[PDB]
């Protein structure tokens, strides 16, 4: 047996594009993959519970191409929250013109096309060989979390839960924060501790996690 694109990926990464155009079969498979790291098949000789252990990274576009500022994301987007709940993170990257930012946006694009060398900042991005060496080394640890951060995480979870449920049931509201949201926050704080290369978690990381979580959708209000 040789598996499909997901199976050839394991303890690694996967990429997908135009998710809205995929079939309900793909939706059913990825739904099971995202939360549980197995796969079930009952077609033929194959009756396996195959191990995926894969990381999913999809992308798509709205129903109308450009955003609908007069409709909520929960309606403009085509995917259902019944599945999107498993998506611990979600960004809404839409564009509105502005006189100043596009100046240097065009500057950057023109420079990179003039020559592949990225802007000549006093900075040297490094080879993916070294990046993979670093990520492999950081993957060796398995840090721990204290109670001083646990209680703050619980308080923030309660805050977000109540605020989103009672207040965010309106124009710019997407569903509600979930236990999966809490688990993702915890996992990302663990990743931050791994990057710092310490076997303990500091209170200085949950702040970053929640900051990014609530900044993912800042543009929805402009």
């Amino acid at each position: 047996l040789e598996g499909g694109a997901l199976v050839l990926a394991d303890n690694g990464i996967c990429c997908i594009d135009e998710f809205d155009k995929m079939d309900e079969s793909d939706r059913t498979a990825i739904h099971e993959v995202m939360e549980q790291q197995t796969i079930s098949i009952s077609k033929a000789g194959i009756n396996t519970t195959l191990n995926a252990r894969t990381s999913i990274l999809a992308a798509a576009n709205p129903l109308y191409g450009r955003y609908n500022p007069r409709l909520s994301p929960l309606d403009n987007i085509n995917l259902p929250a019944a599945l999107l709940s498993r998506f611990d993170i979600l960004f809404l990257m839409l564009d509105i013109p502005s006189r100043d930012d596009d100046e240097k946006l065009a500057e950057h694009v023109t420079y990179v096309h003039m020559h592949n060398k990225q802007p000549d900042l006093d900075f040297t991005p490094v080879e993916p060989s070294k990046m993979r060496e670093y990520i492999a080394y950081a993957k060796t640890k398995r840090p721990v979390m204290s109670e001083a951060v646990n209680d703050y995480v619980v308080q923030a979870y309660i805050r977000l839960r109540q605020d989103s449920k009672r207040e965010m049931d309106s124009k710019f509201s997407f569903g509600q924060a979930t236990p999966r949201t809490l688990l993702g926050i915890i996992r990302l704080s663990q990743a931050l501790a791994k990057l710092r290369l310490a076997d303990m978690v500091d209170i200085d990381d949950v702040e970053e996690a929640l900051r990014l979580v609530r900044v993912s959708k800042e543009s929805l209000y402009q």
Partner: protein, 641 residues
């Protein structure tokens, strides 16, 4: 000095060492291996076995690892299992006769001398699937753990090469030499000298019994990019009708090799040798999960009894543990302690867990004289907001249940559910393969994303949910089989983020009857509020606070082992017959709840029978109806709308 060519094994020295270890072993492992009353661990088996006339015996590896004078025997039985066991087959009888010397007995000696003996090393060193078996380590005692897919017929083998001389009214006898027969072409020169006049007859000869089993390997670790495989093996006589489809197995054997012919025409072989495995023992049960229904397997029980092969089929009990069980059943906090114990790593979900445990209890298994059958199984459905422990609970149930399969979404079809026909890769012949619906025959069937699954596939379950009997009519196959499996699956809500102010019987994207016929359903709506969220948050963060949740044992949580043994004994030993008092509450509860079909009556009775089975009651009583109706109404949350 006595030794074997190219070997470091001694016959008489090994015999003496084996006898010394046998005479001297008293739970040495409880002392050396760990800190954990009794005496002479081994000797009891041999003392008791004599009167029952059995030519079998089991054997561990940890005992040799523990005793002082068996460490070297360890590697010698490892490298040369067949030779060491052939030595042991004589050493065991030597010890038997040297132990009878201290006893006077009635004249049973006519049997032991003519008898034989064999061993079965079962709990041995671990092996990492088949990837580890590079050709350096061939022909050695090995262990594995996998499930069963396909079983083949009986292969006879020439064991007594009879021969018929054409003249001189004489027969002839000759035996096999390392797996070949050399027919003596001559004709017993003395009486007659015809150098090539003899014949062959099959009815006279003796035959051996062999099987071949296709197995699916289920390791504990796999490399980056692994996928399932299939292996073939060979069992031999006295082990037939032991392992088949629908059983998880931990096994032992001996990796080997063999070439195959290039045709049925001449002797030209392949430079590559097809591998295989020859069995030494099969372990049919384990500690981390209960066992098969006892009434479901009565015919096989009696068949094995008659065949005098008694490999384990059901776990055995101890009187002290039975008394402990009766003591634990005395207290009244069982009804919530079981729920707290099923999943200590999750928030309460009290009624969900209680229903899961009642399903594991199962219920009632009655039959009529010829035209009835009513099995213990109540189909269960889940539904509610995502981002909860529904999938975790389902995976837990699949792990803990012995006989079940996992199916996901629309990746399934009627052909791959019921029986389907395929071809073998070696014999090149039309051979079948069992379907996932039948593989779980007795136990659990898990589904997720029950909504998007294809309508074609959703059609089949109508009859499974009723008579537990699938039917097949396709190429060369006409038979109706049995699928006593149970159903336990999740469902997703219509649209997304749910709709509070709408009838939920129409808020699922699923037709009425398919949902109504479910025996019981559970609802996982959100209802966000403190006093139910901060507690959960700490409950789940303290899981990670430790490297592994062993501090979770606080708050009165039982161990898995005693719980499972209690469940198995209760399942196998008690049969609560329906009572009279429960009628006047059951009928009224059903009628009042109709204000949505008669299947909920069957659901309620089958769940009240499981409740009566709990507490070890041999009789139903009125209270079970109360709990059943109250829990049904709470599960559907009648008070809301």
């Amino acid at each position: 000095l006595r030794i074997i060519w190219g070997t470091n094994v001694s016959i008489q020295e090994c015999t003496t060492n084996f006898r010394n270890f046998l005479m001297s072993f008293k739970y040495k492992f409880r002392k050396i291996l760990d800190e954990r009353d009794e005496e002479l661990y081994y000797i009891k088996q041999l003392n008791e076995m004599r009167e029952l006339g059995t030519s079998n015996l089991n054997l561990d590896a940890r005992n040799l690892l523990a005793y002082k004078q068996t460490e070297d025997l360890y590697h010698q039985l490892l490298n040369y299992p067949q030779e060491v066991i052939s030595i042991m087959d004589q050493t065991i009888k030597d010890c038997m006769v040297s132990l009878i010397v201290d006893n006077n007995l009635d004249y049973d000696l006519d049997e032991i001398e003519t008898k034989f003996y064999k061993v079965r090393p079962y709990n041995v060193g671990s092996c990492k699937g088949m990837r580890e078996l590079n050709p350096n380590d061939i022909d050695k005692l090995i262990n594995l753990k996998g499930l069963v897919l396909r079983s083949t017929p009986v292969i006879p083998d020439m064991k007594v090469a009879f021969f018929k001389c054409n003249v001189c009214d004489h027969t002839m006898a000759v035996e096999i030499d390392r797996g070949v027969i050399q027919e003596p072409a001559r004709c017993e020169r003395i009486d007659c000298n015809e150098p090539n006049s003899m014949s062959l007859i099959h009815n006279r000869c003796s035959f051996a019994d062999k099987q071949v089993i296709k197995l699916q390997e289920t390791p504990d670790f796999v490399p980056d990019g692994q996928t399932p495989h299939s292996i073939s093996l060979c069992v031999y006589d006295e082990l037939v009708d032991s392992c088949r489809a629908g059983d998880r197995i931990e096994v032992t054997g001996t990796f080997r090799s063999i070439p195959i012919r290039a045709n049925s025409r001449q002797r030209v072989l392949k430079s590559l040798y097809k591998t295989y495995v020859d069995v030494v023992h099969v372990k049919k049960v384990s500690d981390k999960r209960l066992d098969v229904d006892t009434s479901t397997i009565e015919q096989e029980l009696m068949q094995n009894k008659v065949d005098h092969n008694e490999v384990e089929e059901v776990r055995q009990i101890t009187d002290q543990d039975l008394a402990k069980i009766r003591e634990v059943a005395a207290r009244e906090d069982l009804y919530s302690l079981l729920a707290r114990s099923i999943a200590p790593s999750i928030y309460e979900l009290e009624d969900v867990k209680k229903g899961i445990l009642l399903q594991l209890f199962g219920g009632t298994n009655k039959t009529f004289t010829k035209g009835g059958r009513y099995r213990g199984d109540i189909n269960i459905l889940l539904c509610g907001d995502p981002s909860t422990s529904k999938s975790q609970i389902l995976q837990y149930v699949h792990k803990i249940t012995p006989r079940g399969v996992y199916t996901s979404g629309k990746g399934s079809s009627a052909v791959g559910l019921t029986a389907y026909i395929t071809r073998d890769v070696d014999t090149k012949q039309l051979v079948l393969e069992s379907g996932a619906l039948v593989l779980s025959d007795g136990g659990v069937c898990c589904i997720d994303e029950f909504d998007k699954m294809s309508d074609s596939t959703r059609s089949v379950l109508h009859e499974v949910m009723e008579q537990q009997t699938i039917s097949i009519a396709k190429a060369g196959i006409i038979t109706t089989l049995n699928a006593r499996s149970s159903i336990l699956a999740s469902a997703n809500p219509i649209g997304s983020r749910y709709n509070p102010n709408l009838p939920v019987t129409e808020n699922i994207d699923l037709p009425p009857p398919l949902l109504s016929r479910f025996d019981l359903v559970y609802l996982v709506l959100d209802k966000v509020d403190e006093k139910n969220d901060r507690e959960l948050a700490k409950h789940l963060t303290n899981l990670y606070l430790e490297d592994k949740p062993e501090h979770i044992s606080q708050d009165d949580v039982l161990p898995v082992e005693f719980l499972t043994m209690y469940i198995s004994y209760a399942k196998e030993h008690i049969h609560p017959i329906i009572t009279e008092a429960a009628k006047t509450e059951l009928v009224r509860a059903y009628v009042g709840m109709r204000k949505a079909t008669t299947r909920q009556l069957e659901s309620m009775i089958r769940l009240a029978e499981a409740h009566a089975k709990m507490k070890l009651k041999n009789v139903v009583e009125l209270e079970d109806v109360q709990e059943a109706v109250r829990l049904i109404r709470s599960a559907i949350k009648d008070y809301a709308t």
